Structure 1
């Protein structure tokens, strides 16, 4: 079978979630994606801060 019309959370693998998986998660994939985006922003921020006098 196919999935429902819900919004599945991404975890670097598009899985075939079915049998009414209406928002069943602990909050680990979204927190990891937000931490990865924050690290990718903070690396550019630290590079811009260290490239102040250079």
Structure 2
């Protein structure tokens, strides 16, 4: 089972390993990281707006 061994696979929703012979460079629309950042910032503003709700 020749498995990817190179430096750093970027994270995904499912966090799955890149293939045996992954050419080993990131080609991606970046939509992954966009969704990740927006995912965290939603929680951020949730907290920030709660703090107002109690005021």
Q: TM-score, normalised by structure 1?
A: 0.74
Pairwise CA distance, 1:16: 3.7
Pairwise CA distance, 1:50: 1.2
Greater shift after overlay, 34-43 or 14-23?
A: 14-23
Cα RMSD over matched residues? 1.9
Distance 1:42 1:6, change over 3 A: same
**Count of aligned pairs:** 52
Residue segments in structure 1 that go unaligned for 5+ positions in a row: none
Distance 1:10 1:42, change over 3 A: same
CA contact 2:12–2:32 (8 Å) conserved in 1: yes
Residue segments in structure 2 that go unaligned for 5+ positions in a row: none
